[PDB]
Design a protein around this nucleic acid. Structure first.
Ligand SMILES: Nc1ncnc2c1ncn2[C@H]1C[C@H](O)[C@@H](COP(=O)(O)NP(=O)(O)OP(=O)(O)O)O1
Ligand SMILES: [Mg+2]
Ligand SMILES: [Mg+2]
Length: 430
DNA sequence: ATTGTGACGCT
DNA sequence: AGCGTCAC
């Protein structure tokens, strides 16, 4: 009772841009705005691969990983924007620079952890304490939360979406104990006010819309964020967790979407997150290891301790290209030319990074895939990165991988290569 | 013939 | 260090 921790010590938000690469292209080209449209990589094979889809186009069934020719079968009027190509490969610079725009705005409000090109976690605990003392016990108006959903509400004793949203918000606000600056539900609510302000600033200053989750930890904030995408934010309280988890498939929780989550389902004979509460911590550790078992025991109760790391910049800078089917690289000149292409893009990005961010990479990772291997990477080897020079970097990468050529004659490369990858890592201040 | 990223865990 | 998992 009194000594049972409840995981209500922090306020954590997760901000995720809505159809991000699409919004970047729609900002640039107004003809694409408010249309079914998608962003595509390459074009020659089946029209190119779709990597981002506007919500208008999703209504027709268009998804990421679809070929554009097939997407056009579902949506004949689909508009397409193409990823830029440079040195023979897709170049994501426009989206990385748009991401920096958003992350720099978010960093004005709190320390952020860059989780991907379009999402960041925010630790709002301190900002919430400050705003609470500035308030001085004043109630929180629903006008301060114009895009917020309270998960699980309304409940108890209108048929339009916005009406239900406001009904649930009213129920939440009416029950709130504003006199108590240590109430976790009040703390979440103030967190949600701040996240409204943050999202308004992102939209005002970039044109981009986003969704957000506000809860007590990263896993619940991420789950909350997706509950009412797009252009809305969702508060998941500690009290909402039993009902939310009671019908939540295990695979929806971050880190359980793969083999471990399938083994939880298989070994325990359960389907939903909340069913995990019936096992002891030792039982879960016996099946899934000490770390995973303790994590699952706490997470199915809504408790998680993973901190929002103070890290706004990526810690690796990488460049990779697949060479599928008959395009696999089969000569030494081919392998050299593409390592050079990858190394030149890497040198551009690394020089810009050193100027912007006062750091230098010190290790170069070289990874390849051979034809016939079903694994993503087939070989990874490291070497020293001492100079931001594309020819040196590509020569060094070749020296580290040259022994995997099974061919007798040097001029040929066998078995052919289906992926090349260069990654700069191990940054030091400069 | 998804592709091009990126973080972290295990041994 | 090199390999594997998981997520964008
Ligand atoms: N598998 C992949 N391969 C390449 N690029 C990808 C990718 N997945 C995502 N991207 C790129 C394209 C995406 O625009 C961007 C952000 O990924 P999301 O947040 O998962 N998807 P979005 O923001 O589009 O829609 P939503 O409103 O559901 O958040 O990363
Ligand atoms: Mg997104
Ligand atoms: Mg995202």
């Amino acid at each position: 009772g009194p000594h049972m921790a409840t995981g209500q010590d922090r306020v954590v938000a997760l901000v995720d841009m809505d159809c991000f690469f699409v919004q970047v292209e729609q900002r640039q080209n107004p003809h694409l705005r408010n249309k079914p449209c998608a962003v595509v990589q390459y074009k020659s094979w089946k029209g190119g691969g779709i990597i981002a889809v506007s919500y208008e186009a999703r209504a027709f069934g268009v998804t990421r990983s679809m070929w554009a020719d097939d997407a056009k079968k579902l949506c004949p009027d689909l508009l397409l924007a193409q990823v830029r190509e440079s040195r023979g490969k897709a170049n994501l610079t426009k989206y990385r620079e748009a991401s920096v725009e958003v992350m720099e705005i978010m960093s004005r409000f709190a320390v952020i952890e860059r989780a991907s090109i379009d999402e960041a976690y925010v630790d709002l605990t301190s900002a919430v304490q400050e705003r609470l003392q500035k308030l001085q016990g004043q109630p929180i108006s629903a006008d301060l939360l114009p895009s917020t959903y309270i998960e699980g509400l309304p409940q108890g004793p209108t048929v339009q979406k916005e009406g239900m949203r406001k009904q649930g918000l009213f129920q939440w606000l009416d029950s709130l104990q504003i006199d108590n600056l240590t109430s976790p539900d009040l703390q979440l609510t103030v967190g949600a006010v701040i996240v409204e302000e943050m999202r308004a600033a992102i939209e005002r200053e970039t044109g981009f819309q986003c969704s957000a989750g506000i809860s007590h930890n990263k896993v619940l904030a991420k789950l909350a964020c997706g509950l009412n995408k797009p252009n809305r934010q969702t508060l998941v309280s500690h009290g909402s967790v039993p009902q939310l988890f009671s019908q939540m498939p295990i695979r929806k929780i971050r880190s359980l979407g793969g083999k471990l989550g399938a083994s939880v389902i298989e070994i325990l004979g359960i389907e939903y997150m909340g069913e995990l509460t019936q096992f002891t911590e030792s039982q879960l550790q016996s099946h899934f290891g000490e770390k995973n078992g303790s994590w699952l025991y706490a997470m199915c109760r809504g408790i998680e301790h993973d901190p929002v790391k103070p890290r706004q910049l990526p810690k690796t800078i990488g460049c990779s290209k697949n060479f599928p089917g008959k395009t696999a690289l089969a000569t030494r000149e081919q392998v050299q030319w593409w390592l050079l292409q990858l190394a030149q893009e890497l040198e551009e990005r690394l020089t810009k990074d050193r100027n912007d961010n006062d750091r230098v990479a010190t290790q170069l990772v070289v990874s390849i895939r051979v034809q016939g291997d079903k694994r993503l990477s087939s070989l990874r080897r490291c070497c020293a990165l001492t100079r931001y020079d594309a020819h040196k970097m590509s020569h060094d990468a070749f020296t580290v991988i040259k022994n995997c050529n099974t061919s007798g004659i040097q001029t040929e490369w066998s078995p052919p290569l289906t992926m090349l990858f260069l990654c700069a890592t191990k940054f030091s201040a400069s």
